Amino acid sequence: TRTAAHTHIKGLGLDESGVAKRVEGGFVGQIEAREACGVIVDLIKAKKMSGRAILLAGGPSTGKTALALAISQELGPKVPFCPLVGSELYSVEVKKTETLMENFRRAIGLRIKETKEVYEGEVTELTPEVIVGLKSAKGTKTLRLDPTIYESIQREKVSIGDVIYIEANTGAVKRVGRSDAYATEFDLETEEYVPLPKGEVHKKKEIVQDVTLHDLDVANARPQGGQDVISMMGQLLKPKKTEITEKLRQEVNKVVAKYIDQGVAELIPGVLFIDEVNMLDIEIFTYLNKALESNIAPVVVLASNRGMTTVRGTEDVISPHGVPPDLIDRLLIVRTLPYDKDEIRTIIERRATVERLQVESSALDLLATMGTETSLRYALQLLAPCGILAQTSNRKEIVVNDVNEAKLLFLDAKRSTKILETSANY
Amino acid sequence: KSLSLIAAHSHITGLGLDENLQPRPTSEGMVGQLQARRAAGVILKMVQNGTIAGRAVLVAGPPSTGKTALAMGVSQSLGKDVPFTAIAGSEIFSLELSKTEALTQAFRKSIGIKIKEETELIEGEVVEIQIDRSITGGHKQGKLTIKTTDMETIYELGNKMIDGLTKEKVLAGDVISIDKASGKITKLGRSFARSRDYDAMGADTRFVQCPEGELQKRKTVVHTVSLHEIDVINSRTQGFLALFTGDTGEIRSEVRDQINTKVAEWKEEGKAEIVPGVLFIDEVHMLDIECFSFINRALEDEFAPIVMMATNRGVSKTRGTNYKSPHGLPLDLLDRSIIITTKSYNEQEIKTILSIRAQEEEVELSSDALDLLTKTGVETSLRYSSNLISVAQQIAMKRKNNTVEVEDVKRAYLLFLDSARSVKYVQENESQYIDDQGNVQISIAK
Amino acid sequence: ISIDKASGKITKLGRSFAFVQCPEGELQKRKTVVHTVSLHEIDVINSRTQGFLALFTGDTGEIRSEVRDQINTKVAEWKEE
Amino acid sequence: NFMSIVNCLMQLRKVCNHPNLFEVRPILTSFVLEHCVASDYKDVERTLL
């Protein structure tokens, strides 16, 4: 198996009153951040309001992204969490604002119940002008092919002895292959032998395939019928994402409104994520400043931490977290405190337990000392190297020799900087 | 319809004003700002007049002064039949339309035309659809018995409409809103006769809409379209694809000139109806000098819809130039346009607005929590308490009691910080987070 | 001559002469073959139709993340089973 | 009494009979929209043409 710095977190641990335990499901301290996250979790579970956002501010290794993954895994499978970084909004063929609205539209989940049927059977005859006489286990019916799907059928080399899985609603045709009934054609026949499908040819099912707002946007903006030749031209002339305007937005809103008022469907919100908004330019900040003043923009979370630094995209806007003053004035601050000696101890302990490292007491304490001396991450990155070193140096446990070898081998930023002021060359 | 659960801007429905163009202190949600609401009524009467063009007004002053509330109230108060363009100026940049093309598209969208077309109909229960062969003497003996509730009548198909009924596979008895210059017969479903059919038990499975109007009557159907649809039709033979997908492609000028002439003569011929709407733009201090010259010439042009342009910042840097002037705009356009200043609020109107928000959210508040919210809002800003009320309501559920008490607002205040709280917290942590140089002293000890 | 059953492909093991001796053993042999493919290749082959050209021409950019998530969960459950 | 023990035993003979596994694989199809947004505007386009 594989582990990448996470999957140790398995929930906030909020009790019936929303209060999380001290160290439970991969957590250490930060009761303020945990309580604020629980409050936001309850607000999202309400599923009534929208159009509100918060930022959580904390230094490196303060559990910001850890709390984001915790809330993500707490929400559950169906409700989606949208992770995105300021580098993502810089697209290529479309403008950044449209990308932000594509993310917003695909963020909201929309449970829907549409219908699909499939014709699947052994072909009995074809009549050009079109007949495809599909013969299932108990049914043998002859559809008509429109000229385009007739051409698709022609390209499918389907002949007497073939079964095709041609969908009814989309219309595209997927041949299943040579019929297993004609297995007595060649002892080494190349084509696979598939029998006549069960049921009638026009098999009908009730499906729960849902749709995100971007999904049904691309459904009509760039139709994807697929296997038919005309569908190939449709997906080839404009295969990319086109700049959907507000007119199609209103059309889509009407369509989703009528579908959700049909009764079976429903709506569920979602959470979007942004990291290091300090690098974001003033243009996107100004645009989102007027974009959150709407009725559809779902919940997004901000993770940033900067002091008295100029906001990127400007030259004189100095503000904390690299956020313009207006956004700060319209956004909710969550505080995070630096980790402590005992927090470092428990962090290294849990990170050893998840990594299947039975680190003993004194080794754990010394690793905590290094964590408290230079940085938490410097100590955390050494758990696997020290274990592997002790494995190569024939030690199940981690003696002080292993950690000293790691500290003289894998240096930190401070020691490298100490080296850097005494060098004949860079 | 129009799925939008709630918003901080979904609390105003239609504004409030009087025939005297005088403000209402509680004008359907938005309150105060007598000058702002009187000017809104003045502009409303201006646009109802439809006799002036090329006017630019600047909603100046400090931010948070109900500017967006004013725009929303105007939009909801003017009424239907007049589509607007309420888009912030930040997204003018695009990878498919240039700045000139985008500005031209906005200007041509702000001015609309309604079109009345004298289309026809053939309504009535078409109980049967007979399609006879193409006999030489009569090229189509196609019987089809369209009859409304008023009369019983038969008709005949001219070898062109047989597939018009069944472009999509439908049966007879369908109310057909047929158009002579369309070729696409629209079936409305099922329909009724006035007969009891046979003697034995029957007449089952018949409950639908029956034709009501006359067998034939002229319909002067009115359609409203913008210059975008007409221009994209001119540029390409097919225009619906670019209207939906959004890949028009920077249509050329002689198209706009010929559309200008065509619309002028259509208005002169009494077939079209001009609807000169008004454009709304935001963040004008952020606008750039080429846009400044564009609007400067547009104002002097004979055709220019009125402008709702506003700069939240005051005495800010003028984007696109090396100099800063008041409102972030140079004195040329500043003198060319007109100015309406907007000042901030006191506490009581914040209290009233928050009470309106609460009763819109149908939450049984307790006035102690409301007083706490008023104090928190007046200390910092309205939006602070506007979010605090919702989070305190969430805390009210979290403690299993419907009423919003003091402890809810207190927990909301202590959990989520304040701008002053955040700046104090960061200026005491000048060496704990990422800074200008990025120096983060993660080393708690030694 | 060696041919495959499910495809009938021809593979020239070599002419007998005019230079390989006639083979011994049994005619029909079975074996196993393992095929390797990278994550991005799986993402790009099944996302669209013309992506096969993108296997060499590289005529694609910013593949839709839905296909990426589907292939990721496919790989996860393949590894699980 | 004597016989209804065997009434439970009609389960004890299905435990030692045979167990099985699952080895299932997921596969999907494309869901469909067929209301369309074409026919509603083609007539208007042709009228204006």
Ligand SMILES: Nc1ncnc2c1ncn2[C@@H]1O[C@H](COP(=O)(O)OP(=O)(O)O)[C@@H](O)[C@H]1O
């Ligand atoms: N409460 C916690 N419990 C367990 N591990 C944590 C906790 N907080 C942070 N970590 C670990 O510290 C690392 C940094 O945390 P993360 O939130 O991802 O970024 P940062 O905190 O630096 O913004 C993560 O890899 C995470 O595994």
Ligand SMILES: Nc1ncnc2c1ncn2[C@@H]1O[C@H](COP(=O)(O)OP(=O)(O)O)[C@@H](O)[C@H]1O
């Ligand atoms: N006078 C008012 N009455 C009611 N709500 C208001 C008022 N002024 C502002 N708001 C609220 O504030 C939001 C708009 O902020 P606004 O004060 O217009 O900022 P700015 O003036 O900088 O545009 C709206 O969602 C609205 O609910």
Ligand SMILES: [Mg+2]
């Ligand atoms: Mg973090």
Ligand SMILES: [Mg+2]
């Ligand atoms: Mg505002």
Ligand SMILES: [Mg+2]
């Ligand atoms: Mg001029």
